[PDB]
A paper describes a structure:
Here, we expressed and characterized seven monoclonal antibodies to the C-terminal domain of CSP (ctCSP) from volunteers immunized with RTS,S/AS01. We determined crystal structures of five Fabs to elucidate how these antibodies recognize their cognate epitopes on the ctCSP or αTSR domain (residues 310–375 of P. falciparum 3D7 CSP). Competition and crystal structure studies indicated that the antibodies target two different sites on opposite faces of ctCSP. One site contains a polymorphic region (denoted α-ctCSP) and has been previously characterized, whereas the second is a previously undescribed site on the conserved β-sheet face of the ctCSP (denoted β-ctCSP).
Fabs 234, 236, 352, and 1488 all recognize the same region on ctCSP, which is similar to the epitope of the previously published mAb1710. We refer to this region as the alpha epitope region (α-ctCSP) as it consists of an α-helix that includes the T-cell epitope Th2R (region III), and the so-called CS flap, which contains another T-cell epitope Th3R. Furthermore, all α-ctCSP-binding Fabs share a similar feature of utilizing CDR H3 to insert into the conserved hydrophobic core between the α-helix and CS flap in the αTSR domain. Interestingly, α-ctCSP-binding antibodies 234, 236, and 352 exhibit a moderate level of somatic hypermutation (SHM) with some mutations in residues in CDRs H1 and H2 that contribute to epitope binding. 236 showed the highest single affinity of all mAbs towards the H234 haplotype, although like the other α-ctCSP mAbs 352 and 1488, failed to bind to 13 of the 15 peptides. Similar to mAb234, mAb236 is flexible for binding to Th2R as it also binds to the H234 haplotype. However, binding to Th3R seems to be crucial to mAb236 since the antibody does not bind to any haplotypes that have mutations in that region. For example, mAb352 and 1488 bind only to haplotypes H18 and 3D7, which differ by only a single amino acid in the Th2R epitope. mAb236 binds only to haplotypes H234 and 3D7, which are identical in the Th3R epitope. Mice were then injected with D-luciferin and imaged to measure bioluminescence in the infected livers. mAb 236 showed an average of 48% inhibition of parasite liver burden at 300 μg and 26% at 100 μg of antibodies when the mean percentage in the untreated control group was set as 0%.
Author numbering:
A (entry chain G): 311 to 372
B (entry chain A): 2 to 52, 52A, 53 to 82, 82A, 82B, 82C, 83 to 100, 100A, ...
C (entry chain B): 1 to 9, 11 to 106, 106A, 107 to 209
The structure:
Amino acid sequence: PSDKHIKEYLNKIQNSLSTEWSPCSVTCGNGIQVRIKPGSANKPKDELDYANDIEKKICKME
Amino acid sequence: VQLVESGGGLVQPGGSLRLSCVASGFNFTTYSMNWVRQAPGKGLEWVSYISSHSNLIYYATSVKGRFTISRDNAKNSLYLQMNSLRAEDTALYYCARGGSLHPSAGADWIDPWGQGTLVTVSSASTKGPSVFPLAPSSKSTSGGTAALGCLVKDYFPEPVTVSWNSGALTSGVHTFPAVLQSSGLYSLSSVVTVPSSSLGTQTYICNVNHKPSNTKVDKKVEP
Amino acid sequence: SYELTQAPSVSVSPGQTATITCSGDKLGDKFTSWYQQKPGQSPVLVIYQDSKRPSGIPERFSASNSGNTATLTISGTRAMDEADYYCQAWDSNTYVFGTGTRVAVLSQPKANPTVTLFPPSSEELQANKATLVCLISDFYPGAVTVAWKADGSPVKAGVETTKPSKQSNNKYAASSYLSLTPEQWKSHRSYSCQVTHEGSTVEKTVAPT
């Protein structure tokens, strides 16, 4: 999952962005979920640094 | 969605200026805002960035230490304090909206932009033009038509307007864009093409107006 | 600092496809945006995130970004697409713009300039000034080269020439000025303004009379 695609997924689901893990980027294959790192739940979303305040991890499927 | 800049004007090197931008048509408290400038006839140069709650600020190397970005989200306003101004800060300053997520997260474009506010930083003082006649001649006679004009010389700042016969003569009138000399003053010319058969009988007057210096000039142009 | 490079100018016939380049050391790793700017207007977003179009933008626009080159393509270029196109990216907490590519759409037939040259006024000479005015009108495309001569010799000092400007009838106009002393003006027997356009050249000549 490219960093471009993670960022693209971020912008699409930004309104649903939360500390609870996102649904997954894809239904088939390997994707990504994302969430706001809990220490950053109070920050306005345009002030969440991608590197520090957003958690990702793979979402492995077939 | 509208972004209305103001506060632009003329000033001398070393001076200071405060630009404003009033946003409407969207939720100001969820978008990062930017200043981009454009020197006359040149390219786009980003200036500064401000996040929605002013906790993340960035400046271009060219402005760091002299300009300061600020916003007042209750007044839906974006400011830029400009200090220690230099000649090359002469540009149109656009207030343009950033992304609803941090640019590091992909929201890294600018949309929309404002009409801008002009900032001219110059050593020159306001001065009215001298108006000289460009007289019709044998060398200006195109056969049937003839050309005459007015040279509007050594004024600052822009703009000047030129009418002919106080506006009655509109056909054949070409007023050209102003050139800027090394001196820091502008010059332009306005040429009107007229029937060569009546140059000795019909009267042509150019009316120059330089609102900045409150100078109006009428110059008859005869052969 | 990161540099995005662009060709200064591109010219395309209506209905042809235009390609505007934009280089960067590894621009493929960055999202590229494209902006369209028409004379006297604010820029407008036409591409965000390499290829996505802000709906509001015709389908004939489309963009790519791979390796070290992003590319805005305009198929079936219309006249209303004539404008300056800027690429853009994000780097080191900075927005970076390319130099811009001025796309000209050749929607008019070639037209060669009319050149009018005036000598200095008697009034200006009484002001111990001397300005030669060379006015260049009704040409297309909007490009000319101007060359001043004194008794046949090339003159570069004291010359100020404007860029071309679209006039009411979508042709172009320009002006060139030669600043002299009244002694210089009278020392030579003739001065000349030479205008080149699409290979064809026009030259007028004045002299102290």
